Design a protein around this ligand. Structure first.
Ligand SMILES: CCC[C@@H]1NC[C@@H](O)[C@H](O)[C@H]1C(=O)O
Ligand SMILES: CCC[C@@H]1NC[C@@H](O)[C@H](O)[C@H]1C(=O)O
Lengths: 587, 587
């Protein structure tokens, strides 16, 4: 499965915004089969957006259970001789959908599309009732995991183990799509460099021809057959190889953009086209002021303008798969992307407070075999749909897992190996949490380049930069000599509320963010193996409520409404001072 | 008159803090001679402090009229054979005081001490009732001027024409002081340099000897007689010449600290000891979070620590005489000080809004002959008590007067000339307001070095730095060629609320403060005659309420509680980058 693009392939975008929405507090929907009649006592909701914060209501915001969307649609008239298929680009956590009293789809996965042919349940020209049942619950076999808890009164409350807030709803595009009656499924392409080759595979209903055209889209070379190899002689050139499906009586044309993408890892260097690289940029989040994680074109354009100004050339889709629009953008603009799945919270050592969670991390009570297989499904879907993007430069299996407990490597080994089985073109990482240090972590052996999320001077060095530097440097050198891999610091940052200034350079002040980030920068400058720096969050984002979070995680370089803290000008001076992709040497 | 210093001269500081305080809303005090009995229905007040904000009450804060202080004191026992005299170091606007049913003092002037012998109304060992009547009203014969307005109901409301808020009360030290029965009044010293001479004058009751001792206080030379001359062979050396009064039967010793102070103005240079200088620093204010203008040692130590860190070597006592403690401090620490009197608001062209003020500035209705003589008294008192301070480097007659109307120079000429008559040792200035530009101002001819308060890019160039630079530079060159004087930019700054960040570098944001101040700095770098830069306010301060002021004037480099905005690090980088007293040349 890959993204619908239009040519003699058509669609009616159904991000019509306003659907009928209703909560299901007493779980009556399935039994009264609500999809059967117009929702009783509904309210208007926006459909590219989370349902949590759109109504300024704490009881919808913290709601756990089943919610219901509904929307009627007229199917276009020129589709009577076509297959009508219905695609949701992201339903966060779980979705099941009924096209007029007949059930059509079901899917467990919050950041990946799922589609299904409904041509035998539609006829072009008339109006059908679409009803969606969305679930936002997490158990130990979900990606990410969690524990629902039902109190004395029967009220559900969801507990989880990741920082960001558990936003849910229809966060991305809904889509009615038609394609000619022979070509259905997937295409895959792989690219090589010689210090200039390709490959093709199409799955459709008949003969296939493929022609690579360039940005002027004049044909630069053509083959036809499911496989073989053509050759050819800040932001990146994207050719376009146009694959055609000659068969039955109708032809089908699909355009797939390809970039000359190359890379594996070599010793201590993350090369690109046989070129050393330094990652600069951010751990991101899909989080905005009123839409939750809902995608929005304005926000995307503005935050790319911000990363462009600040000099970042890369980022990482922190803790879940992102809106594909962003990877198409990264394609055209030459942004380097670390693709991560929703597998966060595999750790019960991070929660901090005054408050019964399972005692053995890897076991049947928690992360079991079912968990490992749901995980492998998540990696499967992320690779299945982002495989042809040039901007995806590395896969990341999970984020900050607890690898101290027994059973950790028995769990993660088949996943690393299987993912290498899923695509050998790009490297494999697993971002490492602070407390599984160099002397302790179990799984770093299995990955190509190890990524570190370290916060010396914040969570563990009590605001004392002068010792934090020393600790961070030992640990740096230790990691490299233990694995002689490239080191990408994927998370590093401190909570700072915009407006707090202090002569004493204290924690939470803007001066402290500046000083802390630049001391980290000084040690980066001095160790061979660090090939990347991505600060911990570009903007402030929302989290669940707790004594550690003042209205959200304030570790951002920008505020939630995208206004710059002082450190935004620190980074801008450093990241645009170096030349592109090259690390500042030691002074 | 000069400050009491203790040796065989004694005192009991009466900043005992808590006095009895009462408002007099229906003007009953004088007629019921309240000083006669303990105040009826009083509340505790602090006496180094303004009465306005100490009670968190809007009706005391905006009160106009008469207020009453009271406090009983036991006179020390070892004073029975002495003159007991009572000194208030500052009663803001007007004060009259009764020592136990007998009236002893009266004074019109808010920032200068006034004292009086009350030895025949006291006897050592017993307790006396001190009652003070403090008035906070301004008319056109006050320094500064104003207009009280009585509405339909008989309620007074005070109108004035200066930015800062009209704080009042006992703002500085109260003091019981004793000195031996021969020496009463003044001493004056004058110092010269030869690319090393002095003079003396004592007024007392009998023969005088004087001996100059140095910081090790070993006598370095001695004379005796009211006059003559001795000679000798970042922060400044302060000798100490100890003047003694030999007479009657009792001797009296007064210690007066002297600094080798030198300077007049030469062409386009403000020399010091025949050395070109660049003023750096601030226009200040006496304004803090709960004391109003009340002096406080902690605040003084901290804000000197801030000016020291930031690299400022100078400041100007904006719009009234300061606490003498600060000029003693500036003495020991080598801070250069522009001494200004309370003569602000001689201008009716500055108020901006939607709201009957007199039509002719210089005339009998407003600033008349009585006004000119009250003014000359104010200059008289400021020079009379700050004449021997080395840190005072220049007198400033007034701040931002309206010189366009007819009669302006007829008013200001006898004042400039008279002040030059009051002390020829230090130069004379009159800070100039924006709208009396180089082609218009009437009085700049009469002063030694002209000081400019300019705000291009804020009040008159609508937030457009790129035109503001050009305007400011023409006007610069124009001023110099018109007078070939040194130019000290005494005010330049913009309102910026800490916390407002903006990618667009808009007005009120911290980025705009940084950009604006540094563009001003670029033009300063390029014009010969500017010999000084003092930004408009070090910290945010309170003003009266209006649509132009958000909780006060936000033009400060620091917030009112002394926290640094981003520009505090801009200035610190520039003012400590140059060497001391030398201007950065053009790049
Ligand atoms: C010490 C663990 C740090 C943690 N790392 C994972 C991110 O998802 C969180 O945002 C980050 C944080 O605490 O902000
Ligand atoms: C354009 C006149 C500016 C004015 N200059 C006098 C200062 O007393 C004020 O504080 C300052 C201001 O507006 O802030």
């Amino acid at each position: 499965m890959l993204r619908p693009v239009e040519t003699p392939t058509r669609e009616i975008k159904k991000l019509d915004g306003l659907w009928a929405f209703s909560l299901d507090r007493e779980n009556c929907g399935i039994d009264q089969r609500w999809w059967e009649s117009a929702l009783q006592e509904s309210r208007a909701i926006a459909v590219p957006g989370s349902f949590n914060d759109q109504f300024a209501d704490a009881d919808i915001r913290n709601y756990a259970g089943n919610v219901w969307y509904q929307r009627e649609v007229f199917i276009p008239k020129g589709w009577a001789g076509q297959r009508i298929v219905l695609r949701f680009d992201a339903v966060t956590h779980y979705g099941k959908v009924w096209v007029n009293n007949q059930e059509v789809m079901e899917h467990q996965g919050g950041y990946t599309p799922f589609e299904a042919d409904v041509t035998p349940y539609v006829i072009a020209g008339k109006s059908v009732r679409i009803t969606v049942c969305v679930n936002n619950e997490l158990n130990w076999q979900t990606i990410p995991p969690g524990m629902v808890i039902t109190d004395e009164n029967g009220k559900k409350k969801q507990s989880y183990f990741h920082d960001f807030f558990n936003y849910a709803g229809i966060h991305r595009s809904v889509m009615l799509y038609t394609t000619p009656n022979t070509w259905v499924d997937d295409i895959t392409v792989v690219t090589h460099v010689a210090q200039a080759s390709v490959d093709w595979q199409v799955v459709a209903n008949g003969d296939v021809s493929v022609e690579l055209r360039d940005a002027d889209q004049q044909v630069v070379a053509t083959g036809q057959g499911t496989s073989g190899t053509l050759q050819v002689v800040g932001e990146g050139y994207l050719y376009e190889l146009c694959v055609t499906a000659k068969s039955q009586t109708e032809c089908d044309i699909y355009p797939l953009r390809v970039g000359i993408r190359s890379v594996a890892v070599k010793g201590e260097q993350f090369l690109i086209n046989h070129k050393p690289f330094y990652f600069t940029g951010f751990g991101r989040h899909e989080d905005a002021d009123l839409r939750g994680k809902g995608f929005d074109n304005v926000l995307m354009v503005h935050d790319h303008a911000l990363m462009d100004w600040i000099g970042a050339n890369s980022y990482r889709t922190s803790h879940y798969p992102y809106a594909e629009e962003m990877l198409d953008w990264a394609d055209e603009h030459g942004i380097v992307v670390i693709d991560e799945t929703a597998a966060v919270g595999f750790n019960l050592s991070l929660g901090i407070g005054f408050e019964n969670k399972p005692k053995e991390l890897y076991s049947e009570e928690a992360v079991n075999g079912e968990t490992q297989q749901a995980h492998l499904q998540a990696i499967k879907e992320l690779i299945a749909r982002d495989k042809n993007h040039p901007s995806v430069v590395m896969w990341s299996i999970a984020n900050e897992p607890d690898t101290r407990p027994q059973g950790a490597r028995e769990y993660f080994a088949p996943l690393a190996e299987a993912t290498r089985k899923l695509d050998p073109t790009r490297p494999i990482t697993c971002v490492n949490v602070m407390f599984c240090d160099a002397h302790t972590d179990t799984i770093s052996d299995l990955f190509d380049v190890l990524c570190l999320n370290r916060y010396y001077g914040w969570y563990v060095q009590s605001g004392d930069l002068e010792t934090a530097e020393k600790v961070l440097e030992k640990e740096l050198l230790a990691w490299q000599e233990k694995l002689h891999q490239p080191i990408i610091i994927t998370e590093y940052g401190v909570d700072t509320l915009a407006g707090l200034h202090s002569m004493y350079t204290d924690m939470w002040s803007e001066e402290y963010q500046c000083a802390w980030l630049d001391m980290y920068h000084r040690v980066f400058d001095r160790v061979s193996a660090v090939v990347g720096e991505q600060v911990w969050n570009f903007a402030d984002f929302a989290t669940s409520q707790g004594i550690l979070r003042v209205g959200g995680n304030k570790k951002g370089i920008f505020t939630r409404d995208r206004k710059p803290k002082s450190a935004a000008f620190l980074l801008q001076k450093r990241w645009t001072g170096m030349n592109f992709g090259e690390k500042p040497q030691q002074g």
